[PDB]
Amino acid sequence: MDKPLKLYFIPYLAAGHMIPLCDIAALFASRGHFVTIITTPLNAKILPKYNNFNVHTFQFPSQEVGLPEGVENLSAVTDLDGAYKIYQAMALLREHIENFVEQHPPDCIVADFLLPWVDELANKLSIPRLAFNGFSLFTICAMESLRSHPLPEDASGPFVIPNFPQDIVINSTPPAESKTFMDPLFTIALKSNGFIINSFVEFDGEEYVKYYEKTIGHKAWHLGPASLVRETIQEKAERGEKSTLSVQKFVDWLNKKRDNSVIYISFGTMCHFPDKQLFEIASAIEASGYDFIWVVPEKKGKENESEDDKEKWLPKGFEERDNGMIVKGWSPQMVILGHPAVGAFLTHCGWNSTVEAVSAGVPMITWPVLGDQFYNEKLITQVRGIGVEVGVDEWVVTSFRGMKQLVGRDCIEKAIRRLMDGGDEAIQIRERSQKLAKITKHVVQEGGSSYENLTVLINELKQLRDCKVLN
Numbered sequence: 001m002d003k004p005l006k007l008y009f010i011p012y013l014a015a016g017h018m019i020p021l022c023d024i025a026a027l028f029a030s031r032g033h034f035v036t037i038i039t040t041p042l043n044a045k046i047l048p049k050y051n052n053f054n055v056h057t058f059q060f061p062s063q064e065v066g067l068p069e070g071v072e073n074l075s076a077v078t079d080l081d082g083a084y085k086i087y088q089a090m091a092l093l094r095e096h097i098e099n100f101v102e103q104h105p106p107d108c109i110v111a112d113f114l115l116p117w118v119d120e121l122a123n124k125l126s127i128p129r130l131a132f133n134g135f136s137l138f139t140i141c142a143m144e145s146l147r148s149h150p151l152p153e154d155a156s157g158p159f160v161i162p163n164f165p166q167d168i169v170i171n172s173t174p175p176a177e178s179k180t181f182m183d184p185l186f187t188i189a190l191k192s193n194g195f196i197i198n199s200f201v202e203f204d205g206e207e208y209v210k211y212y213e214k215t216i217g218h219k220a221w222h223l224g225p226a227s228l229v230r231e232t233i234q235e236k237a238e239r240g241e242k243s244t245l246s247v248q249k250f251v252d253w254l255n256k257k258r259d260n261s262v263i264y265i266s267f268g269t270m271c272h273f274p275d276k277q278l279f280e281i282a283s284a285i286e287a288s289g290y291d292f293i294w295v296v297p298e299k300k301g302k303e304n305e306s307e308d309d310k311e312k313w314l315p316k317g318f319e320e321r322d323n324g325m326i327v328k329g330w331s332p333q334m335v336i337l338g339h340p341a342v343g344a345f346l347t348h349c350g351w352n353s354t355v356e357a358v359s360a361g362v363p364m365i366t367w368p369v370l371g372d373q374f375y376n377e378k379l380i381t382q383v384r385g386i387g388v389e390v391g392v393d394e395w396v397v398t399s400f401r402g403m404k405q406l407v408g409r410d411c412i413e414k415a416i417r418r419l420m421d422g423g424d425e426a427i428q429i430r431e432r433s434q435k436l437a438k439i440t441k442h443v444v445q446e447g448g449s450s451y452e453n454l455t456v457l458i459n460e461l462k463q464l465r466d467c468k469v470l471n
């Protein structure tokens with residue numbers, strides 16, 4: 001405790017991984033330790049400078065991979081071809097990230113599991129390495145259960161998480177490509193000194209801290225929710241990028257609406273639905289009759305579209321009926337989720353949006369797509385009971401318009417009304433959502449579970465640095 005720790009954080013150029021890790025680094029910084037983000041200039045510009053908070057950037061290799069100069073994240077990409085160009089950009093930066101870490105070795109490296117080469121880098125420098133994937137510990141425990149008890153290569157439909165602390169049924173089997181991509185990364189992540197979890201034990205579950213520790217034989221650190229590090233309006237509004245619309249334009253509009261009368265629809269920064277699916281979503285939105293905030297990254301840069309182009313995905317006259325806001329870009333998700341007018345959150349079950357909704361006490365209408373989301377769906381609806389399910393069952397490989405099955409409008413409206421119409425089921429769902437919101441308000445506060453976990457982690461990291469000084 002005599003001298004602060006020097007911690008490096010290497011996020012992946014994706015909003016779902018970049019945003020939570022930087023807020024976790026901000027938690028270390030408010031303790032008094034010198035944290036350093038290693039990313040690209042555009043991912044660093046939005047980062048609020050805290051005490052002990054600094055960045056080390058290398059220029060994004062734009063023409064080496066063949067992308068426009070303003071594109072330095074997966075959220076700016078609209079194509080699977082563009083997604084791999086981000087990956088090759090990470091491969092090119094690896095050379096300079098390794099040289100910088102070797103020249104100025106830190107007390108501890110915290111890197112995303114999509115960068116598994118950090119294992120050798122931390123090993124040859126003999127410094128403790130932490131892993132981060134943005135998942136829930138529940139989801140990590142479930143995916144490690146399938147990796148030990150695999151599905152037969154003819155499986156289809158629902159399946160049970162094998163030999164699990166609770167009996168839970170996922171509504172679709174993972175694609176073969178997901179297993180062959182996740183399995184190598186999880187194996188290297190388990191070689192680390194510990195896993196950082198952007199969550200808190202009251203939400204994941206103690207029975208899964210003890211599952212991960214005793215069955216899998218590894219350490220996980222519940223430091224979340226990290227978004228709670230942002231307290232001001234400007235801190236909650238400036239996340240990832242600048243919001244496309246004036247933050248005051250959202251607040252003024254929402255301030256006129258009733259409490260729990262607006263539905264927020266957003267499917268993350270990696271999911272783009274085809275025009276036919278957006279048409280069903282919009283048709284279900286107007287048939288529900290509720291005011292809405294709909295995030296449509298599929299149409300960013302497509303304003304003042306021709307009527308022929310807008311009728312590909314919107315019912316005729318949808319925009320003339322001004323019962324909501326179409327955000328064709330980046331919306332202040334923390335600002336909108338925290339407003340009392342928002343009563344439901346139609347989500348893709350990405351983990352950042354999940355813990356953000358938990359902190360805001362907004363029940364969720366679940367629509368998983370890929371990755372950890374199908375596991376996250378049942379953590380929201382069955383285990384914790386803070387949402388309803390649309391009923392989707394297509395686990396896609398690519399969320400860049402890879403959906404082959406159409407989710408009907410009646411299916412969506414039925415799910416929207418189950419929370420917004422204020423039924424008995426919806427009333428007690430919101431009561432279970434506020435119960436977690438009150439718990440979440442102090443988990444990273446002094447005395448909270450996530451706070452004391454960060455204290456124990458920093459001590460053990462300080463211990464290992466003291467041993468390296470001996471040698």
Ligand SMILES: O=c1ccn([C@@H]2O[C@H](COP(=O)(O)OP(=O)(O)O)[C@@H](O)[C@H]2O)c(=O)[nH]1
Nearest residue numbers: 016268269270295330331333350351352353
């Ligand atoms: O218009 C948008 C879309 C997303 N987000 C943020 O981006 C993250 C989305 O990550 P998540 O894990 O929920 O989904 P992913 O994009 O990784 O699939 C969350 O922090 C959201 O608050 C945002 O601020 N504005």
